[model samples]
Target: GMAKVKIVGILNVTPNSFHDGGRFVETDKAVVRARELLSQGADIIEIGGESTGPGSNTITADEELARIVPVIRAIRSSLPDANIAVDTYKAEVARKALELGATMINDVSAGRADPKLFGVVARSNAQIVLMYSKDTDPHTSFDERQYVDVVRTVYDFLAERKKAAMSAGIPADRIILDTGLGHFVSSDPQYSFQLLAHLSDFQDLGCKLFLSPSRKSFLAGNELLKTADRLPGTIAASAIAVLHGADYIRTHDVLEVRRGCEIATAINQPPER
Candidate 1:
């Protein structure tokens, strides 16, 4: 069976994000960017207040809310019913963003950084994307580890987190799993591809799969391609991910990736007589 894939466009309202950071750091700029992403066929606009890139520093919930709330509010007011996802693991930030009309919580920490995040999402009735990260802190980017079987490792971690979210009162369908790519998985680009190849290995858990290879370091390799130069690799990885079983593609280039996944998903579908 061929499953339809959704695109979640990135809108990082941070200064140091690996890709397109300071570009949309202000509320006005963010609202404009959010509008652009939505118009570009993005199913969801994921707004982030802090950079989760390598060696990034953490900010307070107050600062996060300050940066994110205005953007959420402006976007909500402008679109009235747009799908907005706040990319934060801080409970207070999640609460505020949801109150301001955000529809989902894309937590890189997967509730590891802030345990209260689960309850916030559960109470807010928002969808949660739990990513499997090797590091407990989402702020840093240089935590690579060896995995005898990387797929099994990510699967087990996501399963455990899913159980935890369910125990906290969030329903199963509302939870999405992201097998962390880039630094979240490992410094080695090979691990990212390995996880993509084995995405079907995670379906038994019964949660939506989110694939985010958006300008990750692994795509750069030895050439060390800058974030701006990684879109082609990202689109290719996204299409491969969709073919393997990804339910959503989280990316910076929404229109391009959306087009790529559309073709990939169609190819996976059985031909009509």
Candidate 2:
């Protein structure tokens, strides 16, 4: 069978994530959302504590742990076999989350935020999703950064990060690469769209590629659309990603994106050769 894309549902536990922030800050509510994500066809539930969006406040590691620990524990107890991913760049948070049964770590910093994070993930034998970001602080207002070639830069960054992870004892198979989209790339939406256009370029890295264009600002065309209005764009972007060979789709609108991915896969697949 052809490898299918995995759906990663976004579950923000922070009080100020760009969208659906405070909605799941409560432990009980967060646990319920985790279950709901799986019910909605999410292969993995990514629980993020800090808001990395523009103008969002940053929290200390202790505060981040406080926001995610109880929810991880509750979900682990409730859904023993469920795949859980904790979005954090802190080594301690990654370590503890793994102890609580988190299956993956989504590090936007790509090991630059905390080098110890590599060792933490390696020790746990858990998967790590390394993202390429232009800024060290993810919460900064979008930087209209220039790139000689954004795709090449991201490819090189991920190549080096994958080497680093493997050197730290993380198997290559356990590493996933994310070509940071939206603010993580820049304020100019062109770069994000450009990356998607060249997404297949990352396949040679020999790691699974994760596309997380879920309701991102880049999807909003010239209309200055709000987050609520970005779902249709997200669906189209996700379908494009799948057609270009993405291995995982991280999204807020799971059902829609997943269905879009199914149709795109149908169009992209060929009879067994």
Candidate 3:
């Protein structure tokens, strides 16, 4: 059974995302953006309220709910068949989102942020993405960027987290693992690249894999490319990730990345007449 790589469109509904900040603060704008993402070939649309990137502060649950719930509710009502994931680490917010019709949980904390998160997911039919980081928080406060072996350590952390998810009742098939990147987890840009270079090493985790390289500081090593201008690097990195065993790619430029994934996936198979 051969399946093409999946592209997850990023819908940051915050006023301070590194790239598309202030673009979708209103519910109507967010809904319109979600439609654009679907038209551009996004397998799923990931809506994030709080920025988990480096040097970002956390927002309260009420604030996050006010930002995301209306948008999610609007999207679900408009597109009944759309696949949606709420990118938050809070358990209560995640549950409310699921009630609002979100089908997935894109938790960068991998259940470490809130101990009750996995348990919540286990009870619902929602899919979960457990990302690897230094510790369990999504704040820019502490750093876990230092690692003796990046691939080995991150792979091990995901394995342990997978066990925890299963213990909490989340089925193995419903889980996905993201190695993480940038300052919040990988610490530096190069570390994130290194993880991408050796991404296939994490295949032994026995679950689907997820990668978010869209305009990340790791992809934009240059201060100039630090913003949304890193589209070229993001596409290049996305292709490499696809060739190296990435199942899902999260990106801002969905159409560009979708084309890149098609080419990369084509290269993985033999030529046919």
Candidate 4:
């Protein structure tokens, strides 16, 4: 029997996301895109109100809400059965989306941007995807890029954040750790690869792993690949992440990554002793 591999599709409904921002910035278009991803075999659709892409500036809560709420409501109405995740580090945005039927909160800031986000997630029983970053703006600068041991630093950061979230009453199982690729390490693809190579090390932290390598600059280098051109690399990286024990692969190329997961999972089957 083929085991199902969970895949989370990235939906950036902002005007400034690194690559595919304005493409689905409208409500109807965003909903259409969400349905396409769901139909393509995504287990979860991550909707983002703000663009955390490189050099992307912040938006007011009102503007952020304006961008995401309509899309969330539309997705809920259109695909009520679909598992939806709201991607934001803002407490207000996350709170409203949770009320509107979002099942998970994927906070790239790991609750550092907004301390109130922890309480909201706890109250809503929403699963969280926490990324390891040192500042409020996850994509602003990579100055914190220096680390004595990258993997250990990430492990410690996530472990501490997980403890904080739990202390705030969020269930431990509701937490997922993202290795924080591309955000700070865009200059070092080799380091990002190392993180994926040793992903299972994070399992000891007692949280699921969420891997997002889709179309990131580090993976493709300065020669920016169009979203279409990025699919092959994204699929390959996703397969590698799965092989290394990633619990979820966050991506924009849903169909390709879905197939990649299927293929990779088959190859990763345990050998008989």
Best by lDDT: 2
RMSD of 2: 3.1
Query: Can you rank all candidates by lDDT, best first?
Result: 2, 1, 3, 4
Q: List the residue pairs that clash in candidate 3.
A: none
Question: What digit string (tens of lDDT, one per residue) describes model 3 on residues 15-36?
Answer: 5454433535577788988999
User: Which of the predicted structures, 1 or 2, would earn the higher lDDT when compared with the native?
Assistant: 2
TM-score order, best first, reads 2, 1, 3, 4
TM-score for every candidate vs. truth? 0.93, 0.93, 0.91, 0.89
1-273: candidate 4 lDDT, tens digit per residue? 435568998888765444444634577788888888988989999988777766777888888887888888888897889989988988999999899989999898889888999999999878998987645675546442555677888888889999999998898889888887765554556678778788888899988888888877667645766566777888888898888778888887888888988888989886655
Model 4 lDDT, residue 106, Cα: 88
Candidate 3 off by > 4 Å = 15-25, 141-144, 222-224
lDDT of 2 by residue, 54-88 (tens): 88877889889988898888888889899899999
Off by over 4 Å in 1: 1-3, 15-25, 221-224
Q: For model 3, where is the 10-residue window of minimal lDDT?
A: 15-24
Scored against the true structure, residue 259 in model 3 reaches a CA lDDT of 98
Residue pairs in clash, model 2: none
Superposition error at 89 for model 3 (Å): 0.7
Name the regions of candidate 4 deviating beyond 4 angstroms.
1-3, 15-25, 142-144, 221-228, 271-273
